[PDB]
Amino acid sequence: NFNFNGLTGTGVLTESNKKFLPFQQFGRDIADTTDAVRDPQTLEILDIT
Amino acid sequence: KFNGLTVLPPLLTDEMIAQYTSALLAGTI
Numbered sequence: 370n371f372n373f374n375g376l377t378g379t380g381v382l383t384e385s386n387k388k389f390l391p392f393q394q395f396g397r398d399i400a401d402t403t404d405a406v407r408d409p410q411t412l413e414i415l416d417i418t
Numbered sequence: 419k420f421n422g423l424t425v426l427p428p429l430l431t432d433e434m435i436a437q438y439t440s441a442l443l444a445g446t447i
């Protein structure tokens with residue numbers, strides 16, 4: 370049950386291969402479902418499956 | 419991915435359906 374800064378969601382986290390632009394915090398799927406986050410302390414992208 | 423929306427696979431997969439149409443074609447021919 371992860372709580373990134375205001376993204377309180379329940380998922381397994383995976384080591385993504387996505388490249389967010391420097392200011393983009395979390396990824397979003399086609400049907401408005403969160404797919405990925407930037408960990409705010411290590412600027413790496415985790416996918417939420 | 420979805421919320422409780424899940425998708426079941428079909429019982430007859432694409433390869434088997436291709437085999438059934440192959441059987442129908444070989445029979446027809």
Ligand SMILES: *[C@@H]1O[C@H](CO)[C@@H](O)[C@H](O)[C@H]1NC(C)=O
Nearest residue numbers: 391407408409410411412413
């Ligand atoms: C947060 O601090 C750690 C050191 O404790 C550092 O490695 C990390 O890069 C910092 N986060 C950011 C976003 O700079």
